[PDB]
Nucleic acid binder design. Structure first.
Lengths: 199, 134, 80, 78, 123
RNA sequence: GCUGAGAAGCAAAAGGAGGAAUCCGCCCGAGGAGGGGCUCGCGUCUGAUUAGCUAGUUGGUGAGGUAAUAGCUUACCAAGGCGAUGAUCAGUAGCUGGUCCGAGAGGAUGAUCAGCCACACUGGGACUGAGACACGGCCCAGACUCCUACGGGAGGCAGCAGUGGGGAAUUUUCCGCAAUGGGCGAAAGCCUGACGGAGCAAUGCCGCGUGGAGGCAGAAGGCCCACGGGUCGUGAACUUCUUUUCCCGGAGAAGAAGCAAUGACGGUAUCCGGGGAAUAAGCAUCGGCUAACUCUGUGCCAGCAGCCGCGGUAAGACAGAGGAUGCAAGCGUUAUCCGGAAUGAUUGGGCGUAAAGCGUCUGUAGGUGGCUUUUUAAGUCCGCCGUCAAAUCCCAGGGCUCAACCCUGGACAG
């Protein structure tokens, strides 16, 4: 699905989901009740690291089991490799290049078939990019400057070291797989990895 | 002189130092001589001495210690048999285990002689794992 | 004898074919002494393994129609 | 393949000897070396084997239902 | 149990996961014929009138099955569909009856958790 | 060529097409490939509340017989042969590459995919051919259904579709030989319910959408409130952007094989244009495990429940509402299997008192066994070689817009 839903709920519960669904911080007129008082079971903590990951990328949870099985299946730090297989997801890159303000914005911006990759169109948000790729607009998007609106309001945050945004010819490419320091979201890999040990 | 001549030496080692006594008297057969030869040179024990009592050549073996502590030896020795009589174990040069990464050794009976994991891993030979200590 | 023949090896609407020299009595997707060849009619290569086709044709396993036609594209036919 | 050496059991049949064959075998789940005996009928036109001698079985053309071997002699390299 | 000969005879084997429903013996749920629709009481700590239908099955057994929910239509000689699951309170009742299936209607006026009771959506 | 010691004898043929050329044949040999027929080592479920079994039985010869060895068969002789390491009997079961689980050892299992076996209404026979004791062959018996003009006939869906029954439950009385693979033919071609497609079903695995961005923090309402308010809630309403999908039109494949032609799929896939947020979210749970909680009604009643147990007036456990949680075109319950389970234990348990040491002793089979020296290498180890089909799993590439799936190559184990 998309979850397509009320989302300041998820920001108040999970903590501030960075970039995804807002640059606006939560509870501009809210939070004036509901003392937590400090009781939270540890399973709630690991569950909130699931959904801190799952809402921040908009994944289906069954697909997140799929990415964990591939992450175990690869060789190396599974806590990091999970955040390589979920960074080189395409609409995360179009978010990170500022081609859309939010990640539902990027997912819808790639559903309606506005992205060529290496000159070929990719209609699917779960496309996993590679090193040395090419990410452009559509030919109609020099007449449909929605991407240029997003690139107009974007450039507070610059880019991490895989990206290379070309200003008017609108091309962004990733030099190499993103480093852990490079990952934008702040979370503990071990907490999430431990949670899926049960399966 | 029971069923095993290797649980002889080995159980005399465990029973020796679990009572903190730093002295072993055991028989000196060929394989006991070989084990203490490949065991004094690996830093576990201090000295092995042959002598005779009624012209029966024995090994007295001095264990390691440290200084006056709650117990004068810190690292407990932890000797263990593997290839029991009646259940023989055999390994290739693949299965041959790095005990605790290497902090233990697995003395085993090659066609060369009896080696350790160092001296049977470089050879590429394999054989009957006598016992591993750690 | 043996009859060098294709076998369908792929999904629906795909037609990736192997060239296998199985006995002619078998069903079309069986087992071979040596699975010699490849034929991808959509657009791709065709590995042939010339010495083994010359082994079986040297023995006398006649091929089918379009296997023979693939063998007539390349210059495989030598009578030695 | 190998021959099957083994003791002769009882030769009260013309041209025919029963042979115990002792074979070590690793038991599957538990890792010992269990022996299994299996006794055969071997052929000899010479019938020069008493009770208690030990022969080597080699495959030949089947002579009866059970008699599918003829045993000649071991090598004897001690 | 030594590795030698008390155990290359056999250890022993555990039996199975013993069947928690002796009827239904193919697979999960099985058509039933109502014989009695009586009502019995639980053991001592509880206190209720639980309403069970003793039901003949198409397998070959006869077995007293529980009826969930509040309302029940089940008269004599109707057809039900029993499923497994042990009601603890009743000695002998091993099975449930599915509601909303054949000739056993859904419960009256339920709007929380309807898939367990066979009631379609309102609204 | 065969029989036989030799002597000796014995045994075959088919023509057709073409003007010819020649080609397809035929008969007798000799090899090879592939396919079969046999034999053997090893592996191949439980039960001792089944302990003896076996007399063509196990051998030997002679006579026969088989494509071939053979108690395959027969006459006579010998008394063998199997078995407490489970014979015989009884019960269960197609087997294996594999599937699923497990950290691992291994446990359970054998659908689709693939190899071998067996059966073809229930039994029993033989015939021809290279090859059957033959699913859609023949003959007989038995049971059953149809036809009959009453004497007789005919029949085998465990082929594909389909009907009826049984069942919780499993589809269309479809299109096509275009490919692929068969069979026949010199070729032309013909026939293929194999196979290639299509239809229905969330049956499963994967991908995608139900909107994106803003939204005065002002109103209408539900629920709860120390009546201050809080929370539904940026949620909606509302303003713009977009069209995956949806509708309305155009174009339009490869798949098909170098003589051309040759497409069931199908005007399908895919692409282009025109509107339009439009056509699209449910289901469990919220006492602990186990994330999610308060309020109203009920008053050991109705009921819930996986285990513990809640329910006799203010129930965080029943029923409803609100809210929340987890999932998502799925969500739950049940059944079966493994895990957890070290709860059958080799890895990995125990026996003073918790379940458990025979009342003690002799000893057969069997199991384990002192030291030195020497020999063979059966075990053991190392090298090389063969094989364990293909598919699967693992690695690395490649193709479908990705994935699922498909394909190419490689290999440790063992």
């Amino acid at each position: 699905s998309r979850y397509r839903g009320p989302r300041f709920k998820k920001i108040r519960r999970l903590g501030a989901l960075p970039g995804l669904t807002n640059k606006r911080p939560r509870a501009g007129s809210d939070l004036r009740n509901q003392s937590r008082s400090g009781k939270r079971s540890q399973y709630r903590i690991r569950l909130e690291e699931k959904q801190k990951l799952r809402f921040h990328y908009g994944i289906t949870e069954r697909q997140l089991l799929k990415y964990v099985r591939i992450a175990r299946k690869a060789k190396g730090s599974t806590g990091q490799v999970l955040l390589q297989l979920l960074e080189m997801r395409l609409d995360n890159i179009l978010f990170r290049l500022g081609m859309a303000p939010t990640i539902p914005g990027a997912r819808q911006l790639v559903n309606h078939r506005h992205i060529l990759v290496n000159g070929r169109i990719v209609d699917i948000p779960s496309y996993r990019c590679k090193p040395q790729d090419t990410i452009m607009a559509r030919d109609e998007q020099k007449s449909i400057a929605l991407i240029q609106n997003s690139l107009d309001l974007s450039p507070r945050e610059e880019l991490p070291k895989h990206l290379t945004l070309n200003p008017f010819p609108y091309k962004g490419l990733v030099n190499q797989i993103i480093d852990s320091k490079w990952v934008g979201l702040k979370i503990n890999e071990l907490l999430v990895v431990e949670y899926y040990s049960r399966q | 002189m029971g069923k095993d001549t290797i649980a002889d030496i080995i159980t005399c080692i465990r029973n020796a130092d679990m009572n903190r006594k730093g002295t072993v008297r055991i028989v000196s057969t060929n394989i006991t001589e070989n084990i203490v030869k490949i065991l004094l040179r690996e830093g576990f024990i201090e000295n092995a001495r042959k002598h005779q009592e009624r012209n029966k050549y024995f090994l007295v073996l001095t264990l390691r210690h440290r200084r006056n502590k709650k117990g004068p030896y810190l690292n407990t020795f932890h000797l263990k048999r593997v290839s029991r009589p009646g259940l023989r174990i055999y390994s290739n040069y693949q299965r041959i285990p790095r005990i605790l990464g290497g902090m233990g050794i697995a003395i085993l009976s090659t066609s060369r002689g009896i080696m350790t994991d160092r001296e049977a891993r470089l050879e590429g030979i394999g054989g009957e794992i006598l016992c591993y200590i750690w | 004898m043996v009859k060098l023949r294709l076998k369908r090896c792929g999904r629906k609407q795909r037609a990736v074919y192997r060239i296998v020299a199985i006995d002619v009595r078998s069903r079309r997707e069986g087992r071979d002494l040596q699975k010699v060849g490849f034929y991808d009619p959509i657009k791709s290569q065709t590995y042939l393994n010339v010495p083994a086709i010359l082994d079986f044709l040297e023995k006398g396993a006649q091929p089918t129609e379009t296997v023979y036609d693939i063998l007539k594209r390349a210059e495989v036919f030598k009578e030695f | 393949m190998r021959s099957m050496q083994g003791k002769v059991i009882c030769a009260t049949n013309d041209k025919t000897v029963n042979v115990e064959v002792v074979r070590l075998a690793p038991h599957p789940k538990y890792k010992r070396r269990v022996r299994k005996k299996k006794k055969y009928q071997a052929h000899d036109p010479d019938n020069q084997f008493k009770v208690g001698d030990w022969v080597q079985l080699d495959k030949c053309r089947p002579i009866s239902k059970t008699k599918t071997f003829l045993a000649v002699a071991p090598e004897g390299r001690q | 149990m030594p590795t030698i000969k008390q155990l290359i005879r056999n250890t022993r084997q555990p039996i199975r996961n013993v069947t928690k429903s002796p009827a239904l013996r193919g697979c999960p749920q099985r058509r039933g014929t109502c014989t009695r629709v009586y009502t019995i009481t639980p053991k001592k700590p509880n206190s209720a009138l639980r309403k069970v239908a003793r039901v003949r099955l198409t397998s070959g057994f006869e077995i007293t099955a529980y009826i969930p929910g509040i309302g029940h239509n089940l008269q004599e000689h109707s057809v039900v569909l029993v499923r497994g699951g042990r009601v603890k309170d009743l000695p002998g009742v091993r099975y449930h009856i599915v509601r909303g299936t054949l000739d056993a209607v859904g419960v009256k006026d339920r709007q929380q958790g309807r898939s367990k009771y066979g009631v379609k959506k309102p609204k």
